[PDB]
Amino acid sequence: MLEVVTAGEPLVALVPQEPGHLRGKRLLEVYVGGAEVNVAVALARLGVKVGFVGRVGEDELGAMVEERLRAEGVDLTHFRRAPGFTGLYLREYLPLGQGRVFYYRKGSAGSALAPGAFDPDYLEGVRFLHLSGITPALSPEARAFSLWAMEEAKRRGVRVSLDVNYRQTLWSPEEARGFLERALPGVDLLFLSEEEAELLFGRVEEALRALSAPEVVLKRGAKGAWAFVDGRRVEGSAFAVEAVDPVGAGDAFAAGYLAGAVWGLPVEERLRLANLLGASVAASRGDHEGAPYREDLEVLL
Amino acid sequence: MLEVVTAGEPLVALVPQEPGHLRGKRLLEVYVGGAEVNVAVALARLGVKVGFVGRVGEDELGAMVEERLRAEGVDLTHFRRAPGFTGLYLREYLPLGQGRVFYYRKGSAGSALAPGAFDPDYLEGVRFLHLSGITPALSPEARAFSLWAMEEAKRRGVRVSLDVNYRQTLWSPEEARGFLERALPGVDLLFLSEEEAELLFGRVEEALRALSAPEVVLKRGAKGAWAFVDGRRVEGSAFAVEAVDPVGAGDAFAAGYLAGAVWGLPVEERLRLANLLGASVAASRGDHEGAPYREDLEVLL
Amino acid sequence: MLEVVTAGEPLVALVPQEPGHLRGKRLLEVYVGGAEVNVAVALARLGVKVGFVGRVGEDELGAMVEERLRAEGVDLTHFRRAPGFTGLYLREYLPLGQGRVFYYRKGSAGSALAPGAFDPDYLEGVRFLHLSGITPALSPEARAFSLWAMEEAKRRGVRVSLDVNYRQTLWSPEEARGFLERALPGVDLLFLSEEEAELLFGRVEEALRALSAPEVVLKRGAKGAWAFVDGRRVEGSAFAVEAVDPVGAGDAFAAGYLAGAVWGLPVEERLRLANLLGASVAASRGDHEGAPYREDLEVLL
Amino acid sequence: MLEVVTAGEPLVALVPQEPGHLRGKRLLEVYVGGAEVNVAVALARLGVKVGFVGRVGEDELGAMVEERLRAEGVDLTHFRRAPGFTGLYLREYLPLGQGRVFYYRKGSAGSALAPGAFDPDYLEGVRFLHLSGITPALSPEARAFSLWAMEEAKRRGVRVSLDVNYRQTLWSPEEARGFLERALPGVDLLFLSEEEAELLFGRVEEALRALSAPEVVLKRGAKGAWAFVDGRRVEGSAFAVEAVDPVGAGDAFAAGYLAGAVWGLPVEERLRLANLLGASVAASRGDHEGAPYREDLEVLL
Amino acid sequence: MLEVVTAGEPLVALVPQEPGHLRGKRLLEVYVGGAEVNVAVALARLGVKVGFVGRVGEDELGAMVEERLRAEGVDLTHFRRAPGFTGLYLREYLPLGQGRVFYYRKGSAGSALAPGAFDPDYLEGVRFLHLSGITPALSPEARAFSLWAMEEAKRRGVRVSLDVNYRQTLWSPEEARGFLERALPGVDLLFLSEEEAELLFGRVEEALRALSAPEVVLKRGAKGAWAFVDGRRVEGSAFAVEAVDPVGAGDAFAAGYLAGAVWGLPVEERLRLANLLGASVAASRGDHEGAPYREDLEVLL
Amino acid sequence: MLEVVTAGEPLVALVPQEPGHLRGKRLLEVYVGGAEVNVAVALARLGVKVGFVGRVGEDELGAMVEERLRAEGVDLTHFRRAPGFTGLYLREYLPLGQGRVFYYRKGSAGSALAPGAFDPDYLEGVRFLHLSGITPALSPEARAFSLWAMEEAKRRGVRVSLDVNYRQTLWSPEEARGFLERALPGVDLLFLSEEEAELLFGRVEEALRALSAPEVVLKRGAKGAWAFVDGRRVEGSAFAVEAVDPVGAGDAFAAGYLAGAVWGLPVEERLRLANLLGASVAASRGDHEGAPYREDLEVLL
Numbered sequence A, B, C, D, E, F: 001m002l003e004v005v006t007a008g009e010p011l012v013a014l015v016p017q018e019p020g021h022l023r024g025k026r027l028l029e030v031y032v033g034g035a036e037v038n039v040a041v042a043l044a045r046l047g048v049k050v051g052f053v054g055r056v057g058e059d060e061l062g063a064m065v066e067e068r069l070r071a072e073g074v075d076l077t078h079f080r081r082a083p084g085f086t087g088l089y090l091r092e093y094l095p096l097g098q099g100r101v102f103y104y105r106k107g108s109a110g111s112a113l114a115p116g117a118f119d120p121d122y123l124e125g126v127r128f129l130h131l132s133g134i135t136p137a138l139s140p141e142a143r144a145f146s147l148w149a150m151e152e153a154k155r156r157g158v159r160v161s162l163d164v165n166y167r168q169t170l171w172s173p174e175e176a177r178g179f180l181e182r183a184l185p186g187v188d189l190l191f192l193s194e195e196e197a198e199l200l201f202g203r204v205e206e207a208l209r210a211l212s213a214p215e216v217v218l219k220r221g222a223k224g225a226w227a228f229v230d231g232r233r234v235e236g237s238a239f240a241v242e243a244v245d246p247v248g249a250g251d252a253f254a255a256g257y258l259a260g261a262v263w264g265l266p267v268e269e270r271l272r273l274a275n276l277l278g279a280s281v282a283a284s285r286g287d288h289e290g291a292p293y294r295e296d297l298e299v300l301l
């Protein structure tokens, strides 16, 4: 029944209505966030049978997250409000472009995900299993969870799509590669941004040799992206649009690709689709508000 | 020379613009809170020389706490940004009155507060040293600070004011009673709200027997308040207005009482002043936004 | 198994942010309404298994109706988007109380509702079938549906609940009385608001004689309400709060009564529950935004 | 033919969206005010043919005054934009009720108003000529206009209505009393608010003796109002609603009284009408935003 | 006295504050719309004596429309609130550019306009008579109205300016041309957009031969426009500006041209002016909010 | 202790939330303004010991200004609320770019600054003394103040940095040069915009010969700027950013330069820094909201 299964800790996003330092702000918008959540919702809007695995707290915010996933029609068979608090963060985008994020996630009910965080018979028949580097950077349990996950998916013959999503706050470049070197063996698909490649490896190049998965997609910001399949290297043109809030764009990019593959799409149409979802998210507010719905696809370049 | 010195954990309050369940709110108002901070501003606006002692993380909200403090005129000699984050809390006020609160302050830069947090010589010549039962509830480190704090003011001939401000989310009634029995000997003035007394000492009367400090004041909500000084029991009438946002209405109360005290007025005037301040805030949004200014008093009533 | 099944025309409500004449309003708040939809959500939030049967056009607002329904947990097995548009209505609440309403629903996708709209077997084992006098007023097609609907639930041993909810803009008192005399035999529980009774049956007492259904409840605004069960007449005290937006306060009422019923409680508790729900909504904006959740009840009062 | 002609200084009012000290407000609501303008709109909305005589600078706000006037239907035959600026004023309404006002109108284009400001023949056949004690307080130039104005209406058999509307910021009680003793002989109807009477004539009763005009009405706030016509003293009950923004509640009052008068109704109806208008505005924001329309009356009450 | 006379059904516009699907919105801005209304108001702001012919409903929205036309100083001698409802629509502009509109106009009081919808002696002396394709697409009566109109105008020697404004929702391409083929004989001036030309004819070219009026202006989006007079073909440069809401731009374009002609302007200055008004409307929110006022003209390129 | 000392009259700014004529607006944002204030705050955010000299009124707005200067940590040793009103102005930015400002400053408490407006021993040790052409254009006293100021600064060996900031409303081009010709002798640094140079002199060229100060900086809008030191002429590249509200940009530019010099920066790094602060202010709302803080500098090109 289910084609994709993404997992990790969801978050509630607090953002200023316009650029400027957070200190001068007095009104914050609230959105639902979380790399996997963003992926889970983007896939669902596309008409893809997706399911999300994770925990929120027994508070008002966890209830917000659940309604978003539920209204979006994402499988929550293994998602539920567990005792504890729902993590949140505050963002701030400066006039010229400098941006910083403040987390209030340490200890959340969502950062508990330990191995066996669900029934492996869930993954049966499933095409993909998308996870993001943020999760394992959350808790020893989380790190344990990641690995276990893909293993149990591959065991079911389910392809493992992963997105680096390196976050400086959550851990150092070392521990990052350490994780990578370890989990790369089962990763059928790896999503990576250019900055990340040069921040954890120095030069995109070395990054690309160490991290060799069957299929690898490099998000190059507005310069589109590069998909690596069959030694052959494809390039994708980015959709030119005014970048409202670049947050969530990468996940939409990843979500767009996965829908491409799931629908058995040629590496080009999978890239075109990815850049499209990423331009929508970038062109809007919130973490995944701009995710398109299938019925919108046809009319988009 | 400073007349009052307040100290505790600064906080940032998030508030829906109107009643309802937080889960449905899309916007949040940002306010500078903290029990002792509220007391400190109030006094600052009243012309009383007040100093606040505390720590905000080295982030944007901490800067916002710092900028509000400076804006008011609260001496920050011993207040400063230190590594870590500034704690924040959300607030829900339901259609039928009763609402809930959610903290994001555990492990914050402010809940560090331990003994020798500031140079005691600070308290020299200071009329009062204000604390709140919230402070010692934040951590053993802070619990000790509280004790050291008043022992150091007592040693300086400074009056020690304490407001139970008991918060169940923080510690149990027992954990609270315990701190009270040990603190009380150092307390000259005690503020209490009927609820807290009944929720901690069965019935108001009992609480009063146990906490027999030189001067004790009982906030009875809009139903007035009794001041117990020298075997005498003055009862003070409450001001009438519609309960907007009552959060911190007690801190406004305490500050007005203290100001009158510091101003050497009768018990009947401290209670009026204290009642006026409290109502003005409860009629206002935020945590101490409605606190009146010196100029205003002369006419109000 | 479903305990309640509601059905009628979903609606989108537009509301000025505060009182005044609509002609001067520059902004409108968007809410999900519909009498039976309001009842359905309320129950959904209370833990009662409820199903809504209806149609929204194949447009953006219809999707919004659908997404709210899903968010709450209302079974849409027999609810779905069908060609046409979703009806909407504006709302004016004047400075001195009395306000006016304006519909844009004639010819909508929802006002189609005709016999055999859903598969009757749906009602199997269902405690109640809720309808509203609004439904049969929308069209001969819908008027028949109503009749067929309850005849099909009656045939299934399902209790048939009906709320007059008479709207003059829709049909005349006569056109309404007529539908009532013919419907009534199939009705087990009847909800009525003094006004509607006097505006349709001269005086409350008369209306009561004519509409003598097994169980009848009279909403007397904030002045309480009488429940007429088994020759007995229980009178239930109303909750006190300030009339924010009373629209749909009756649907909240009906839903709380039904829940208590479905929960097998005394008449005295159904009226309390019913009164609590109603007040919570009237104290809130939108159509059922203030409806309380299971968790909340345990403490409210 | 015009039934009423009003005249004075138009104004733009700036208002915080809710109570509190202006110093902290970051947004201001923009409204079209002016005592005589308020009276003029009210009448315009009531179906009474009214003309306003005044000047707005040749700027954007003046255009806004002009556009509101036109929108309502107030004859601007003798109203027009002239070099200079349009005056504006801010408004502060504190948590505990009492608030303050701040003018920015000195030297404005409207405070020019001098004798022969308009062609007197205008007043021909006009039931009333309305003025306000605000006008002559603006400048010797305007003070004279006032006098000339009513002497010219009296000369035309037009009734001269005057509303003390005393503003301390403008002139002293003396400077005001003085204008009153000299104006009064030309006044047929006088509106006064208890406060102004006590703040200018010690006690209400005294003021009444001094200002013995043919018809005199005493606005006693929400506590009603007495109408003194032909040795008789009719007392009119006030409408009940919560004091939103009371600014200009008196102008709404005066306009409703005048309308009833112009409509040849009993004193008991003018007071009801006058009380209704006033309450509707006080229940609304702005200066005359809540003023009801003809259509509305028929039902209100 | 009157130079131009435009006619058709006015509408109230409901629009999101930012891009994104209407389903995720919760606040809508309200503006007055209607191709002719937009034209009528734009002309008036330019200092052109214009008059609007049409009907709104006896509701709050029709009252909004009238105040806009009245405040803007547009002749309403033959415009009035007739019994019934005022039409409205909802718009939605997507992140990348895809847009869709939802109508709630079928049956409005404004869609009744049948022949003799006013006194032909109105058109005497009038230079132009602007109508738009939307009107005849409204009701058989409307279609009858259009034709009759121009006829009665030409009969008075008044030039007939028309703007295609093809709308897919309101009717098919066939019926569109059918109308065109019929009414073209009296159309002295035709306004057409490039998309329209290729959607009702296929290629701009054929469109331009079939539809041959004395003077024809082709709106080519941002690529400016082409005016066809005397076999000679002129081209106009579009004003480069960020396109806020492209709705209403075409009417402003048409309005700008007409003011050019009315003022006896060279085909170039008539085009320059048209592109200017169209850039203003495009550069702002609402349907015609951005229409400039004459006093602004000089300072604009 | 103090490095820079700027002086002049502060103002409160009222601005529309989006472009469009002020007449159509209904909500205004409030910000603190004043060329020197903007300079004073920008310097302080940079970590420069600055002090502001000037007067505000004894009203709510003067209290707003003081909190901004105080929170920003600007020396107010010689700044204080003197009896009287605080000046304000209204701005309005049109769709295409045309902008106009409306002043309500004539007579403000801040426009009194006469010679000896502070204790000259204030300037001791001070590096700079920045003033702006607006001040002397305010009141004869103000003009007297300007001159006296620099004199007393030079007397202390403090460099005199001045910014033309010609304002058409406040005075004519003649009186402007008249002032310039007079005060240029003590001006060590002159800031001038290109338009100003061609509006008071005709051609930038002549402007540059008459006005020859040791160091002169020409703000050329987005084309960066030109710094003239040692006969040598340097050029600065402007930061490309979308211009939100260009108001305050010049002062930020001036503030950025001064921080450059104060920090002993090479004419290039002083220009780079200036263009940076000017791009921030231009890229944000308000008069100086976008001023960066030192900790932000490193990460900015």
Ligand SMILES: Nc1ncnc2c1ncn2[C@@H]1O[C@H](COP(=O)(O)OP(=O)(O)O)[C@@H](O)[C@H]1O
Residues within 6 Å of the ligand: A193, A194, A218, A219, A220, A221, A222, A224, A225, A238, A239, A240, A241, A242, A243, A246, A247, A248, A249, A250, A251, A253, A274, A275, A276, A278, A279, A282
């Ligand atoms: N301004 C933009 N315009 C178009 N596409 C964008 C823009 N910003 C991001 N994207 C899309 O999102 C994908 C990722 O961009 P990127 O920002 O690097 O991911 P991340 O969320 O990690 O920052 C890109 O490959 C691109 O297709």
Ligand SMILES: Nc1ncnc2c1ncn2[C@@H]1O[C@H](COP(=O)(O)OP(=O)(O)O)[C@@H](O)[C@H]1O
Residues within 6 Å of the ligand: B193, B194, B218, B219, B220, B221, B222, B224, B225, B238, B239, B240, B241, B242, B243, B246, B247, B248, B249, B250, B251, B253, B274, B275, B276, B278, B279, B282
């Ligand atoms: N609705 C109200 N009206 C007037 N005064 C109030 C109101 N709510 C609180 N206060 C004032 O605040 C003081 C404390 O009330 P209380 O609510 O008990 O403090 P706390 O914030 O701890 O709950 C009271 O004694 C009273 O003077």
Ligand SMILES: Nc1ncnc2c1ncn2[C@@H]1O[C@H](COP(=O)(O)OP(=O)(O)O)[C@@H](O)[C@H]1O
Residues within 6 Å of the ligand: C193, C194, C218, C219, C220, C221, C222, C224, C225, C238, C239, C240, C241, C242, C243, C246, C247, C248, C249, C250, C251, C253, C274, C275, C276, C278, C279, C282
């Ligand atoms: N202002 C109010 N305060 C408390 N309860 C209210 C209020 N308005 C409505 N209710 C509740 O809603 C129920 C119905 O009131 P009513 O207004 O008559 O329903 P309806 O929405 O049909 O008008 C009442 O019996 C009462 O419990």
Ligand SMILES: Nc1ncnc2c1ncn2[C@@H]1O[C@H](COP(=O)(O)OP(=O)(O)O)[C@@H](O)[C@H]1O
Residues within 6 Å of the ligand: D193, D194, D218, D219, D220, D221, D222, D224, D225, D238, D239, D240, D241, D242, D243, D246, D247, D248, D249, D250, D251, D253, D274, D275, D276, D278, D279, D282
């Ligand atoms: N809160 C209120 N409720 C009802 N009517 C009010 C209220 N405030 C003012 N009014 C009406 O306005 C009229 C005048 O009240 P008042 O406040 O004295 O005028 P003013 O604007 O000059 O102060 C009153 O006689 C009354 O009818």
Ligand SMILES: Nc1ncnc2c1ncn2[C@@H]1O[C@H](COP(=O)(O)OP(=O)(O)O)[C@@H](O)[C@H]1O
Residues within 6 Å of the ligand: E193, E194, E218, E219, E220, E221, E222, E224, E225, E238, E239, E240, E241, E242, E243, E246, E247, E248, E249, E250, E251, E253, E274, E275, E276, E278, E279, E282
């Ligand atoms: N983004 C834009 N920039 C400048 N002018 C525009 C823009 N969008 C529309 N216009 C102006 O409006 C006129 C019509 O544009 P168009 O959008 O094609 O009409 P329509 O309202 O039918 O869509 C054009 O000829 C042009 O002058």
Ligand SMILES: Nc1ncnc2c1ncn2[C@@H]1O[C@H](COP(=O)(O)OP(=O)(O)O)[C@@H](O)[C@H]1O
Residues within 6 Å of the ligand: F193, F194, F218, F219, F220, F221, F222, F224, F225, F238, F239, F240, F241, F242, F243, F246, F247, F248, F249, F250, F251, F253, F274, F275, F276, F278, F279, F282
């Ligand atoms: N749109 C913009 N982009 C970048 N820098 C700008 C922009 N507008 C202004 N600036 C900066 O502000 C400085 C002054 O610009 P300018 O507008 O001419 O000063 P002013 O405030 O007097 O108008 C310039 O030299 C430039 O560095």
Ligand SMILES: O=C(O)C(=O)C[C@H](O)[C@H](O)CO
Residues within 6 Å of the ligand: A011, A033, A034, A035, A036, A038, A134, A167, A247, A248, A249, A250, A251, A287
């Ligand atoms: O950055 C994080 O911590 C998140 O997971 C929240 C964001 O929505 C996510 O990163 C988007 O990429």
Ligand SMILES: O=C(O)C(=O)C[C@H](O)[C@H](O)CO
Residues within 6 Å of the ligand: B011, B033, B034, B035, B036, B038, B134, B165, B167, B247, B248, B249, B250, B251, B287
């Ligand atoms: O709860 C706390 O810790 C706070 O200090 C926040 C509020 O400002 C406080 O409760 C008001 O007394």
Ligand SMILES: O=C(O)C(=O)C[C@H](O)[C@H](O)CO
Residues within 6 Å of the ligand: C011, C033, C034, C035, C036, C038, C134, C165, C167, C247, C248, C249, C250, C251, C287
């Ligand atoms: O009036 C209707 O048809 C509705 O159902 C809309 C409201 O939600 C309903 O009146 C509330 O009972």
Ligand SMILES: O=C(O)C(=O)C[C@H](O)[C@H](O)CO
Residues within 6 Å of the ligand: D011, D033, D034, D035, D036, D038, D134, D165, D167, D247, D248, D249, D250, D251, D287
């Ligand atoms: O105070 C004034 O001068 C005004 O006219 C403004 C207000 O509209 C007036 O006070 C209301 O009566």
Ligand SMILES: O=C(O)C(=O)C[C@H](O)[C@H](O)CO
Residues within 6 Å of the ligand: E011, E033, E034, E035, E036, E038, E134, E167, E247, E248, E249, E250, E251, E287
């Ligand atoms: O599109 C319609 O139905 C309208 O007439 C409303 C719009 O304002 C008009 O089309 C603008 O071109």
Ligand SMILES: O=C(O)C(=O)C[C@H](O)[C@H](O)CO
Residues within 6 Å of the ligand: F011, F033, F034, F035, F036, F038, F134, F167, F247, F248, F249, F250, F251, F287
């Ligand atoms: O223009 C004026 O009058 C001001 O001083 C206020 C502005 O903030 C200043 O000019 C910015 O350059």
